[PDB]
Amino acid sequence: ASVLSFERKLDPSDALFFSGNWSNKSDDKAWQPIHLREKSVRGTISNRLKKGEADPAKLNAAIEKPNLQTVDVATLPFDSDTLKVEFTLRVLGGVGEPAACNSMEYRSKLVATISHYIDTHGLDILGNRYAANLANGRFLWRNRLGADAISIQITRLSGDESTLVGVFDALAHPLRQFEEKSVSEELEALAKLITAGLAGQEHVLLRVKAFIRMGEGQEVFPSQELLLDKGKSTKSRFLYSVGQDEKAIAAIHSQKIGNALRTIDTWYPDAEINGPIAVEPYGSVTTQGVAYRQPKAKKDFYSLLDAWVLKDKEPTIEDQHFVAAVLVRGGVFG
Amino acid sequence: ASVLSFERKLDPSDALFFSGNWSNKSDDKAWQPIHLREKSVRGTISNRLKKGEADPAKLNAAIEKPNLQTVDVATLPFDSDTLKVEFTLRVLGGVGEPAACNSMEYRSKLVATISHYIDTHGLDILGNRYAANLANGRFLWRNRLGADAISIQITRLSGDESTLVGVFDALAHPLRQFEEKSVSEELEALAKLITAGLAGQEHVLLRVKAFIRMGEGQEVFPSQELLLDKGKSTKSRFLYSVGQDEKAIAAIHSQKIGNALRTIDTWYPDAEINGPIAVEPYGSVTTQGVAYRQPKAKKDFYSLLDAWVLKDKEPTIEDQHFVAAVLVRGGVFG
Amino acid sequence: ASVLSFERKLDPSDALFFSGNWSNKSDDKAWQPIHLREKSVRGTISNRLKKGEADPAKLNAAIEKPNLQTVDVATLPFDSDTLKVEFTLRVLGGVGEPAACNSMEYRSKLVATISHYIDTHGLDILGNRYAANLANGRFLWRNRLGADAISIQITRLSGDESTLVGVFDALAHPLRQFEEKSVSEELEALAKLITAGLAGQEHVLLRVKAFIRMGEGQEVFPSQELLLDKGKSTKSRFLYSVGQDEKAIAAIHSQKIGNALRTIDTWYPDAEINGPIAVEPYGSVTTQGVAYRQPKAKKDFYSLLDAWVLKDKEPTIEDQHFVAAVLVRGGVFG
């Protein structure tokens, strides 16, 4: 075939953690950054035991060996009760244009297939569900669980201009389904902004500001970084941070914020049982270790695209939406 | 096989130390924070000796040697007799939902059995005993011993509002049994609140303010940090603290506070002599280097949970209380 | 084998220096803190020389190089003739309850062994001998030598109220033996008070106020703080102080006060030849670099404790008092 490779058109930045009180969301200088700290942890024997271990003497022996570790932790201060998560989002047009492609015959029918898809059903639901996942706060991941209150401030930036698009209560919007009426005037302005940017009509740059009321001293949940037994350190858990040594700030990986944004695919076989999942070529969910959209039940990105392009096996309108959502997510495809 | 994880449902913050005088409990300004200090210690040869040597000559050579060390110390001022320990606690619903699950047929039967548990024997005992361990001050660890008077103020935090749940005399509540029929209305209000949170009905954020009258200038006991012989410092003992650099405040580790709340398990084989212990999959007790709840006796959390779910072997109702209590603790199980 | 550790049950605070005149001991606001000062000191070649160094020109040269140092110094004011030393003492029960132990068999007979010892010959003598070391002012250490007078006011505090246990005359009490049979009623009061606290009967909080008349402007003696070329200080002597920065108060280390309280061991082999010593597991004494109770002879703590507990070889009554005495000193016996 061809060795294509599309570029992501959703470009979120890392989301950095900031701490303050709830009554001062509008006051931008009222939010100090959250830095990582280290603390000692006395481990516990909690994993399933091996076949050998069984015997009470060696379980017991295991419990007396110290098992102590050091972990990263990020928390709100004793006097500040509200996490603040800020990141910018860039939506780019050109979703139908490959950035690389090795078969001249394959490129031609692809762009046509997408172009007329764009032409027919304007990719509004793509923008609508992206938009929705800003308003859910789904990109907060573990920080939304247990929140007293979550208010999300979205603005558009152009030059030196900021424009309030919307202030969404993340807990007033569903995570398991997408609202299809009566939405909101403010939500809808933001789905049309993202769709315009997806399409090419506008230059779109958003500034998200999520505010979670967690309670003084409460632990916040940045991303994890994985580099175990790196020599003398031998620290148990490492969190993610941005900005060099003392200044560095706790953050969620940009791609984790992205993974949340594209969790849209309600269009796969078991979609009513498992709710929405994140658009991936093979509808893979890493936690559950299973692939919705298996290749044998031809509903993966790949089988569908050849059908829809190489053979003109037109697919259903939702699966058509899905393969657009992969091209929006993008990635080397071969 | 099934591989799966559960996230904590009881979420206490670090517990920070403050100082002041017992009269001014209600005045929140009257409490200045406790910072760590360093002090020299001329050490003693106090450990058990090896083969080389119990010879008189080399023992005495060893005592001649200076053996000076530096240690962190936290203590009350010369003019302040009471230690304040403050922390907030969040209680999350969703006990039965695993955070990650490998096999979704195992999830189905797991969420099935736990949901049945919640409906039948409502998790009232769990919130009964978590509540108790707040009301008795078990979370004060070594700071409870010898206290003149411990008064524990607990309050519900709901957006901007703060409502007082109860003021508890921690020396009036047992640490070896959990109280019966006539609990107290204040304790009972609190135990309901924790189970509503455990059960998803309410958003519960509590603020524990614990006052221990100890006497002016008396040493207090934060957590320890285990970094012994790291660097040229040659420091004998590190203590735990939270907050930037010099204004950092001495603290108990959040997970030490949660070990206290989870000391509810009176359901293991020898419990009537040993007393309650903190919930742990293999019923482990680190200070005694022994694992109650051995796998030989199939009383460990895995024997229990496997049986209950894969083979529909109902365990004794106390043992059911235990694995539900493990599930709120959380861990990585598989 | 056992990996026990006992928490200390004698808990004195740091002792802080104040200064005033001898008439006003009863006026608490008539005493003002002693802050440390720096002064310059031109050194002197006073140590023993080393082969090479003994040549005349070499030592002659050694004399002429400045040798200039800075030292901390604490003194009474020009108008204030009396040093006042205040600390608070907590006495805890639970002597025979280890805070940690590894082998379940060892805890078993240990608690029985110690329990019975308490049951039989009650630890009155331990209380008597601590008691006396408050009354002889041993804890004043170098501030005791060459004093016009020494008045030690002891009170017990409970709640908001203080009861005068006694006013002792530390120079009318011996250091080198403990007084024979006939002892003051007030000393008797205090020895019963410490034993009740060691036993568990009462909550014991004492406030010791020692007054030493030494003459206007005289140098007082706090503990020493020992750091070796920490920074570019080149300050040869540092003393201990407690408090913020420049209103920190000269002090004796708490554990120095404690070591003086447990100066009770008249029970080693050479006890008539050397008098009392502070209770250490191997009867060590830092100044003399000697280990009384060497382990060759089976009179150290640990040889004794295994014999008395493991093999039921009960030891001499006086050495049983010692073994109990280490247990209230406490500390990791690894």
Residue numbers in the entry:
A (entry chain E), B (entry chain F), C (entry chain G): 10 to 343
Which statements did the authors publish about this structure?
In the type I-F system, several Csy genes comprise a silencing Cascade complex with the Csy3 protein as a backbone-forming molecule. Among them, four genes of Csy1, -2, -3, and -4 (ZmCsy1-4) appear to form a silencing Cascade complex in the type I-F CRISPR systems. Based on the P. aeruginosa Cascade complex with a protein-helical backbone of six Csy3s, ZmCsy3 is predicted to form the molecular-helical backbone of the Z. mobilis Cascade complex. In order to provide a clue for the assembly mechanism of the Cascade silencing complex of the type I CRISPR/Cas system, the crystal structure of ZmCsy3 was determined.
There are seven ZmCsy3 molecules (ZmCsy3.1–ZmCsy3.7) in the asymmetric unit, and their structures superimpose very well onto each other, with a root-mean-square-deviation (rmsd) value of less than 0.2 Å. The monomeric ZmCsy3 structure is composed of ten α-helices (α1-α10) and eight β-strands (β1–β8) and forms a right-handed glove that is composed of a finger of several α-helices, a palm consisting of a β-sheet of 6 β-strands with an extended region (web), a thumb composed of a two-stranded β-sheet and an α-helix, and the backside of glove. The surface potential map reveals a positively charged surface patch within the glove and the inner sides of a finger and the thumb, and negatively charged surface patches on the backside of the glove and the outside of a finger and a thumb. The seven ZmCsy3 molecules in the asymmetric unit form an inter-molecular helical structure. At the inter-subunit interface, a thumb of one subunit interacts with a finger of the neighboring subunit, and the β-sheet of the five β-strands on the backside of one subunit comes into contact with those of the neighboring subunit(s) through many polar and hydrophilic interactions. In this oligomeric structure, the concave palms are twisted within a single molecule and form a continuous hollow cleft along the molecular helix, together with the extended regions (webs) and several loops in the fingers, and expose a long positively charged cleft to the solvent. The inter-molecular helix formed by seven ZmCsy3 molecules is part of a long superhelical filament structure in the entire crystal system, where seven molecules form a single turn with a diameter of ∼95 Å and a length of ∼82 Å. Since this molecular-helical structure is formed in the absence of crRNA in the crystalline state, there is a possibility that ZmCsy3 can be aggregated at high protein concentrations to form a molecular helical backbone of the Cascade effector complex without crRNA. The hexameric molecular-helix formed by ZmCsy3s, except for one ZmCsy3 subunit at either end in the apo-backbone structure, superimposes well onto the PaCsy3 helix backbone in the holo-Cascade structure, with rmsd values of less than 2.51 Å among the aligned 1912 Ca atoms, and only a negligible difference at the crRNA binding regions.
